[PDB]
Ligand binder design. Structure first.
Ligand code: WGP
Length: 284
């Protein structure tokens, strides 16, 4: 029974290696990684792999790993797939811990934009969670944390992290993690998966997929929002992604909004992440 080596980048940046039978479905590897992580609330998470073209794709747990990675290496990352709108309702602290690690990467990467003060506040909770109570013996006027807090670090940001860290004395790791999440969950790009697209006139837009619904970022003055209920149907055809928007009360006919994606693979990928978010947040 022939087994393939799998390498998974975990949210703390370490590498987990295991073997699965070469015909294994994605669920087999995902169960092994979740057991390694002692993670029970698995529904929010998934594995990603970088494709030929080098884009992120979700490993479909129901399909063979080999038919997804195809010609590529059996290398994956462990990621949050469904960002919970209210992390206080997750049943375990370890769930909220992995969500924090993902968000820290979202922030450092610049996928999750954040004000100066919110960067410093989030940072201060991570420090409290990881080092415990503020100690001046590891902080002179010239302190720079090992912790990556932002896409661009400044001395002013490091100073503000420490000022806020001083205010958290006696906070336990679970408590600082929950405060981290209460702030992060409110940011306007929290849990937003962004896809490049063109509208039906060829104007460059971004489509965001989130718990609540669908976002079209057009210029800056114009952001359209389609709550999942309002979206009656989606589909893709060639390089095109279409959404069918409910008639308001008293109108005879649904409207169709069409988008042009870079290629057929980008259209299908957007379609599948929309279906999955629609299914997930319709049950939540
Ligand atoms: C900026 N964000 C994340 C939101 O406005 C969430 N809310 C929302 C509501 C309807 C459709 C899509 C999204």
């Amino acid at each position: 029974p022939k087994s393939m080596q799998c390498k998974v980048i975990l949210l703390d940046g370490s590498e987990y290696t295991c073997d699965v039978e070469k015909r294994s479905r994605g669920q087999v590897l995902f169960d092994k990684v979740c057991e390694h992580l002692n993670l029970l609330e698995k529904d929010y998470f998934g594995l990603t792999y970088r494709d030929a073209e080098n884009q992120k794709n979700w490993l479909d747990p129901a399909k063979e790993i080999k038919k997804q990675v195809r010609s590529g290496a059996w290398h994956f990352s462990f990621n949050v797939k469904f960002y919970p709108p209210d992390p206080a309702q997750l049943s375990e602290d370890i769930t909220r811990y992995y969500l924090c690690l993902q968000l820290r990467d979202d922030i450092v990467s610049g996928r999750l934009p954040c004000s100066f003060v919110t960067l410093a506040l989030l940072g201060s909770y991570t420090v409290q969670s990881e080092l415990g109570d503020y100690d001046p013996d590891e902080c002179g006027s010239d302190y720079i944390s090992e912790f990556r807090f932002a896409p661009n670090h400044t001395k002013e940001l490091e100073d503000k992290v420490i000022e806020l860290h001083k205010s958290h004395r006696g906070m336990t790791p679970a408590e600082a993690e929950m405060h981290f999440l209460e702030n992060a969950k409110k940011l306007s790009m929290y849990g937003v998966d962004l896809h490049h697209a063109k509208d039906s006139e060829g104007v460059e837009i971004m489509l965001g997929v989130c718990a609540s619904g669908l976002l079209i970022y057009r210029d800056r003055l114009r952001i359209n929002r389609f709550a999942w209920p309002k979206v009656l149907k989606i589909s893709y055809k060639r390089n095109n992604f279409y959404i069918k928007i409910r008639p308001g009360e008293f109108e005879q006919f649904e409207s169709t909004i069409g988008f042009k994606l870079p290629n057929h693979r980008a259209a299908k990928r957007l379609w599948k992440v929309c279906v999955e978010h629609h299914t997930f947040f319709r049950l939540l």
